[PDB]
Swiss-Prot record, chains A, B:
GO MF, any single term: formate C-acetyltransferase activity
Domain of life, per lineage: Bacteria
Protein name: Formate acetyltransferase 1
Modified residues (N6-acetyllysine): 62, 116, 194, 453, 540, 590
């Protein structure tokens, strides 16, 4: 029972546990992390090197926002883990190193997903794609894109064109995968390759015995690619002069090793969301040891965390203008899950929790990393306040219900991927599915499947409603039959998509940091919940007159009589939204899926609320054609007028039990609505979230909360004078973005949203 | 209404049938071919253009044989259907055009199968592989070769090294697929693409309904690639100035269109065997019409057939020295199935049947195309004699039992792929499996799984046979267990192989000329049947005593007495060989296979008899270590001494019902053994084959017969003076090869084989 001399030395001082004999990051954390209930008084400030480096990087960020385009990007190199040479901002000042390419902010080419998108980007930003790269990825190496469109049905193609099913991961990396990068810091590459070889070998029997033949062969090949990827991780780090074959011996190496794990991912896959995971607490274990041993000062600790978070502020991907409108603001979703409570009762909050939030002060506000606080009523009051303070000062944080998710998973080591989709680190991933247009599904029910904007048969050919006034019973009967159809097309599209993504763009380096068998879910999204819900409320509580055209196609409606709206704590309308979520979830649930991915749902839109709303005509709720839907599960623009408590209670009523993939809610409130001074504001904000996230056996509670503390006038001033608010950040749909990174139309969406004036 | 304006012009004069409304080449042949029972008196001679062209080509063939290497080959171009520009021998003289590359005999690079073999070839022949090609096919496009070795088990790797399971299609194209190239001549590319699009669409329902999800998605993608390939066929032909979008209007176009279909295959896949199919009779329909209409003279007809067959004499593939010893003589296996009988009773023999055989006279003897006569007792006596005459003059023909295969398939449109593996054209293919070393499996039984040369554990660890004298019942009981193991490793290796080949090197252009659903078989081969059978005969009827070394490993054998050997019509031994075939077939039959390919068996070796024998030590039958086994199902060298009838009867006793993939038998006989003059020889040879292939309800009969009519001295003279026999051809294992194309060791195998002296 003699532990490898490398392991024993690096792990000097660490408490014993199963984690020393097998891969178990959760156990290591449990046996070693030091819970912290104190306040922010220990926090240090930015060093000269940190500011020098960040300011230099801000110069490129300003250029990006100004030109709404990449600073620079590859034109002739196919990116892989080992493709690029080491790149630095300033080699002499960086405590933590690693960039995607050889230059800061220079975007790369990830061709495995598709060559057409690369061409489109090259055309849009005025650059020329190397002819050789093009030839390779059209004639030799088949891409994810081409595989999907070779199998797609003309039905799906129609839904893609009309705006019923658009923006699905058929033209960009699927993402939604979080490799446990902490594994690299803990065990070192070598130990992980030896573990993978074991996993590979454990499948030999089943193979020789014909047990699930094709599934076995596939898994063996995937594990083989995972093994090869881990080796390239070493080669990559080696370019920076590092040897990560063995475990991290100190704090700087734990941070560096963990980042190197992530760096490999963002160098090989261009997923929509490339999240970081739950690492702040984990890294604290190494920082604490170094402080206690007097090998690192508190300021040097911040500097390290700063340089890491700074790299996370520098992750970039070459995207198309089409992608830019579906996912606005140049988002990365390098999500970090901070805090939370353990299963045993103690808080997972640590000094590093504060250090991470402190990056907002040391380097100013920033959209990335997407810092998420795993909220719990049992959290140390000290942390609850500091978190709120940071939200008040920067509007860069988001909150998710730990009291709900922890018990559900019965695990204290789960992380948030992208915006609100939870997963147990290294043991579970998602099959990203974007979102479907539920609003348009209603209009299709009323119009017999013909697109109210394109006048073409998209949905199944059925007779449109002949009525003179809309009847709730009649309309819903069709809405159901159309939702069945929407569910089938949506699942079929995702099945094709993920079959092709596993084939042409298997995320080898991320799956290499996962267990042998990973739990998979078929994440389906719903867009325009409120538009659909309110439209139903205007038919069961008022008089709607369908203004038809020379074919009987309802292109507009007349409204007489005040009708209920989602976001006012009124059960009559709120009960309809909760019903819709349930209906769709029960529908997709009965369909067969690729790799048996358990279908889940999410009320999330991103900037699809703008794109879909743009392609959707006049709706029964009074919304005009071309107008944006509400971001995520939000009530339609301005409709929630009974203050915070009211709008928070409506969104909390939404069943997370039917939307396991998440329920996004962007909440904006004026400084004065929270109090007269900061102390009152912090206390009240924390109190709001305590009431919102309040979990009990008969009360589920809210799942997500974006917090913006600002005034509409400040943003109006930001639109006129961009150069005055360089680091201004806002929560927009489950993630953050610099205000100056949005287009005039995307900003228009923001400013016209609900700004809570009271409580 | 399935009759376009052009279709009617091209099909002018053709009889009506289902074939005009659907893809059915068999029906077209049935309604239009003119059976011919006459003789060879109508045959024309080679034209000046034919001789000029062939002589020029022979200059490169002489270079090949002398240097035992390629004339030239690509080093920087990845071959595809449209990759190369048109290439000619002499543009002004060629009636039928098309070459793999831009120069005659210049070999190409088919990288999709693996880059390592290309590198190996490049160093062997002293050329430099382009660094870009290498980078692409190691880092971007994964190859078949790399996928297999990523999934292979160390057990399989051991079998490969020891010589128990070697030469499997893990380092070269699998082959064993015959696209119906006649479809191009008949319908034209356009009609076939529309038909494929229909096949693609017919799968949409099952897709949307989740019926066999992954299998459906796969098939849709494959059909999509098939469709794309058909379009590239047009582009390819277009380079030669031809438009094959519509059907062949005359004889020259039927030949050209059919070849263009095959050309696409040999430009994109480097399969071990790239057979032509059953085309001679089919093409006759177009030649006949042109003769009757007085458009083409009889000599012009031969010229066309000559130029086609000449192109089939020019097919080449870049191979490694390793491949060269497993498959000796630079073989292509461009097999042509000639003659046969219909289901209705008439003979499929035609004037073109004679024209094809005549290429042996017009352009001298040639190994390729591998011309196979589908023999039947009901064949026109005129054809039976001419066929024998050709065999007597050239030793370039092979015979297979039509009386056996036709009824078995209950189809008169099946073809021979590679050597002896039958398939219904356009409706069935094989999953090539090379062959396993049965002889070594016996030695493993006796030695407890330890390899007699490498002295390492390969088979299952078990106790070696004790005693100073070998006992049949025991030796056979251990072998039976080891065969179970051999069957599992063999099937597992093939499952991995074909999963990877479908993934990284799907033969798109060949499958595009097949039906939507193709029947697949898992072709398993047995090598050293006679060595194994005779060894058992020795152990059973004589006194075989093992001479073990210090560790107890049996490295030699002593025999007291004489025992019956295979090929002497002695049931005491022949029944054993029959037993072995049956045992193995029943074993592999119980195992699960990729794509549910029905496992079949074949007693075929190719040059694996040399390679395996080289890696197999002293055997119980008296065979010395390193000595070659018998080619295919042949009796061991010289062991069959009771004349033709005796050796033919032993091989015929072998159950084709347990070796559906074929039973190869190379038969050599001296000129005088057949008669005093040609008339007697032809009559007798035909008579031999009538007796050999004789089928009945209680007598199965022989399946294959290679016919060599020569004297050993003539070959000995050929070894001393190569330049004197440039076009000398011999049957060696189920195919033909120019004698000068073999290595000194491969020739050594030939000359030491059985040369039947009597009958
Ligand atoms: Cl491995
Ligand atoms: Cl198609
Ligand atoms: Na909830
Ligand atoms: Na037989």
């Amino acid at each position: 029972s003699e532990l490898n001399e490398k392991l024993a030395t690096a792990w000097e001082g660490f408490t014993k546990g199963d984690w020393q004999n097998e891969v178990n990051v959760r156990d290591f954390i449990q046996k070693n992390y030091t819970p912290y209930e104190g306040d922010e008084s220990f926090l240090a400030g930015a060093t000269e090197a940190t500011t020098t480096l960040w300011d230099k990087v801000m110069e490129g960020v300003k250029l990006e926002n100004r030109t709404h385009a990449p600073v620079d990007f590859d034109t002739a190199v196919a990116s892989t883990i080992t493709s690029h040479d080491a790149g630095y901002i300033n080699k002499q000042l960086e405590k933590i190193v690693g960039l995607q390419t050889e230059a800061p902010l220079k975007r790369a080419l990830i061709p495995f997903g598709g060559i057409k998108m690369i061409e489109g980007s090259c055309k849009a930003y005025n650059r020329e794609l190397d002819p050789m790269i093009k030839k390779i990825f059209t004639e030799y190496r088949k891409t994810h894109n081409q595989g999907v469109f070779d199998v797609y049905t003309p039905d799906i193609l129609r839904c893609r064109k009309s705006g019923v099913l658009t923006g699905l991961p058929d033209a960009y990396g699927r993402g939604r995968i979080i490799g446990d990068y902490r594994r690299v810091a803990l065990y070192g590459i070598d130990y992980l390759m030896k573990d993978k070889l074991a996993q590979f070998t454990s499948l030999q029997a089943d193979l020789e015995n014909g047990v699930n033949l094709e599934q076995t062969i596939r898994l063996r090949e995937e594990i083989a690619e995972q093994h090869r990827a881990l080796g390239q991780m070493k080669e990559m780090a080696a370019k920076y002069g590092y040897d990560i074959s063995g475990p991290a011996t100190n704090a700087q190496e734990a941070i560096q090793w963990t980042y190197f794990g992530y760096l490999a991912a963002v160098k090989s896959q261009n997923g929509a969301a490339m999240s970081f995971g739950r690492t702040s607490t984990f890294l604290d274990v190494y920082i604490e040891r170094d402080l206690k041993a007097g090998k690192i000062t508190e300021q040097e600790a911040q500097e390290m965390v700063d340089h890491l978070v700074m790299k996370l502020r520098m992750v970039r991907f070459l995207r198309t203008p089409e992608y830019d409108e579906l996912f606005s603001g140049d988002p990365i979703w390098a999500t970090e899950s901070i805090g939370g409570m353990g299963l045993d009762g103690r808080t997972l909050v640590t000094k590093n929790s504060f250090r991470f939030l402190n990056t907002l002060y040391t380097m100013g506000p920033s959209p990335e990393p997407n810092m998420t606080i795993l909220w719990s009523e049992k959290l140390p009051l000290n942390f609850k306040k500091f978190a709120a303070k940071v939200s008040i000062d920067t509007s860069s944080l988001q909150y998710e219900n730990d009291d709900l998710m922890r018990p559900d998973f019965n695990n204290d080591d789960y992380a948030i991927a992208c915006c609100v989709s939870p997963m147990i680190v290294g043991k579970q991933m998602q099959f990203f599915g974007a979102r479907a247009n539920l609003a348009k599904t209603m209009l299709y029910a009323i119009n017999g499947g013909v697109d109210e904007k394109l006048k073409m048969q998209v949905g199944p050919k059925s007779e449109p409603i002949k009525g003179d006034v809309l009847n709730y019973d009649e309309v819903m009967e069709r809405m159901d039959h159309f939702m069945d159809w929407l569910a089938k097309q949506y699942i079929t599209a995702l099945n094709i998509i993920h079959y092709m993504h596993d084939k042409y763009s298997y995320e080898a380096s991320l799956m290499a940091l996962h267990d042998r068998d990973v739990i998979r879910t078929m994440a389906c999204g719903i867009a325009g919940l409120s538009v659909a819900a309110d439209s139903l409320s205007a038919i069961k509580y008022a008089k709607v007159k369908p203004i038809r055209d020379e074919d009987g196609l309802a292109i507009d409606f007349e409204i007489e009589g005040e009708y209920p709206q989602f976001g006012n704590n009124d059960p009559r309308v709120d009960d309809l939204a909760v019903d819709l979520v349930e209906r769709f979830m029960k529908k997709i649930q009965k369909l067969h899926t690729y790799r048996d991915a358990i279908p889940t749902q999410s009320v999330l839109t991103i900037t699809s609320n703008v794109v879909y709303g743009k392609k959707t005509g006049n709706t029964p709720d009074g919304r005009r054609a071309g107008a944006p839907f509400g971001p995520g599960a939000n009530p339609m623009h301005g409709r929630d007028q009974k203050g915070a408590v009211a709008s928070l209670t409506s969104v909390a009523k939404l069943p997370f039990a039917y939307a396991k993939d998440g329920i996004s809610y962007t909440f904006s409130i004026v400084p004065n609505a929270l109090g007269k001074d900061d102390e009152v504001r912090k206390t009240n904000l924390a109190g709001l979230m305590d009431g919102y996230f309040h979990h009990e056996a008969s009360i589920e509670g809210g799942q997500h909360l974006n917090v913006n503390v600002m005034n509409r006038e400040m943003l109006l001033d930001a639109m006129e004078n961009p150069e005055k608010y360089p680091q201004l950040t806002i929560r927009v749909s489950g993630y953050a973005v610099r205000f100056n990174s949005l287009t005039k139309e995307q900003q228009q969406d923001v400013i016209t949203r609900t700004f809570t004036q009271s409580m």
